[PDB]
Amino acid sequence: VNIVDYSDCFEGISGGAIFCNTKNKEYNIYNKELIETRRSPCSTFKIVSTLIGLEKGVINSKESVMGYDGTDYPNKNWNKNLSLEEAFKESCVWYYKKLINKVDAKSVQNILDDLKYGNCDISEWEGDLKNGKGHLNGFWLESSLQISPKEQVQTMAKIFEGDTNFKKEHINILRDIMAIDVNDANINVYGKTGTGFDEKNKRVDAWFVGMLEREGDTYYFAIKSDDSNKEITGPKVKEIAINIIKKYYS
Ligand SMILES: *C(=O)N1C[C@H](NOS(=O)(=O)O)CC[C@H]1C(N)=O
């Protein structure tokens, strides 16, 4: 367990990072207090909800559709019968809400418990309805479910090292749709962004969670901002993550 200083890559944004290599148990932690603090996962939950949907047969491949019904949305790419792969990369909320609402709560509770997914609290299934967004809400979006960056890395490691009961076929679908182009062919990077705003504390929940493969070694990582500047989003934290990977993990 090494405490490290990645602050230069954060360019003044408040946050932390944790990288974990489970072969030689090298835990690299920037901002330990924040890395141990549970927060809403926001759209990073799509990593797990994809696996739930595959396991329950709601979806079956990276092509699978959820029966688009024609509802109008401001994002162009939500207005179509998009595949799993496209809905994951577009972070399409209606697709993943319809997916999870096909699964019974007991099944989800038991999967989260098995994964040790933070507080495993799905009590507010419908999500943060006070924000006015209605069905564009759920327990994983600034609501009851909370997970720390350290727990995110532990969950990613358990899934992608083959230590859960999820089918290998399903884990490989997730790897495929999580793959990121970082303009460096000598590392494979996978992950998912998440963006929320914590109204109580007036801070963002901006995430990038995933894994890095670099010649034999695999690192599981979670990068998280809690800045008060509302302009700090998941995509911005992903930029910071890539700069950390290129500086310190090449
Ligand atoms: C998930 O965090 N969300 C869905 C969507 N994607 O965000 S991301 O670019 O950080 O992955 C928009 C924001 C958020 C939401 N409001 O539901």
Ligand 1 center from residue 76 Cα (angstroms):
15
Cα–Cα distance for residue pair 208/222, rounded to 1 Å: 6
- Distance, first Cα to last Cα, the chain: 20
On whether the CB atoms of residues 28 and 222 are closer than 8 A, the answer is no
47 alpha carbon, distance to own chain's centre: 6
Handedness of CA 159, 38, 212, 235 (dihedral sign): positive
Cα–Cα nearest to 191, from 204, 203, 205, 174: 174
Q: Which residue has the tokens 């993943």?
A: 96
Cα–Cα distance for residue pair 24/32, rounded to 1 Å: 20
CA distances from 63 to 52, 84, 219 (A): 16, 6, 28
| Entry field: residues in the chain | 250
Cα–Cα nearest to 208, from 98, 46, 59, 100: 46
Cα–Cα distance for residue pair 137/72, rounded to 1 Å: 17
On whether the CB atoms of residues 223 and 235 are closer than 8 A, the answer is no
As given in the structure block, the two tokens for residue 95 are 């697709």
Instruction: Report the nearest-CA residue for atom 8 of ligand 1.
Output: 194
- Reported structure resolution in angstroms: 1.7
Helix axes 93-100, 46-55, angle to 10 degrees: 40
Cα–Cα distance for residue pair 199/22, rounded to 1 Å: 35
Ligand 1 center from residue 92 Cα (angstroms):
8
CATH number of 72's domain: 3.40.710.10
Cα–Cα nearest to 190, from 44, 59, 3, 38: 44
As given in the structure block, the two tokens for residue 138 are 């759920």
As given in the structure block, the two tokens for residue 31 are 């901002």
> Atom of ligand 1 at shortest distance to CA of 91?
6
Cα–Cα distance for residue pair 164/32, rounded to 1 Å: 27
Mutate to test the pocket of ligand 1, among 39, 40, 43, 137 (most ligand atoms within 8 A of CB): 43
Domain range for 209 is: 2-248
* Contact residues for 91 (Cβ-Cβ < 8 A; gap 6+): 43, 46, 193
> Atom of ligand 1 at shortest distance to CA of 192?
11
Instruction: Report the nearest-CA residue for atom 6 of ligand 1.
Output: 91
Cα–Cα nearest to 225, from 89, 88, 31: 31
> Atom of ligand 1 at shortest distance to CA of 42?
2
114 alpha carbon, distance to own chain's centre: 17
What does the buried/exposed string (b/e) look like for 129-158 if buried means 16 or more CB atoms within 10 Å of the residue's CB? Answer: eeeeeeeebbbbbbbbbbbbbbbbbbbbbb
Radius of gyration (Cα) for the chain, nearest Å?
17
Cα–Cα distance for residue pair 250/245, rounded to 1 Å: 7
On whether the CB atoms of residues 38 and 148 are closer than 8 A, the answer is yes
Ligand 1 center from residue 85 Cα (angstroms):
16
SS (H, E, C) the chain: CEECCCHHHHCCCCEEEEEEECCCCEEEEECHHHHCCCECCHHHHHHHHHHHHHHCCCCCCCCCCCCCCCCCCCCHHHCCCCCHHHHHHHCCHHHHHHHHCCCCHHHHHHHHHHHCCCCCCCCCCCCCHHHCCCCCCCCCCCCCCCECHHHHHHHHHHHHCCCCCCCHHHHHHHHHHHEECCCCCCCEEEEEEEEEEECCCCEEEEEEEEEEEECCEEEEEEEEECCCCCCCCHHHHHHHHHHHHHHHCC
Domain count along the chain: 1
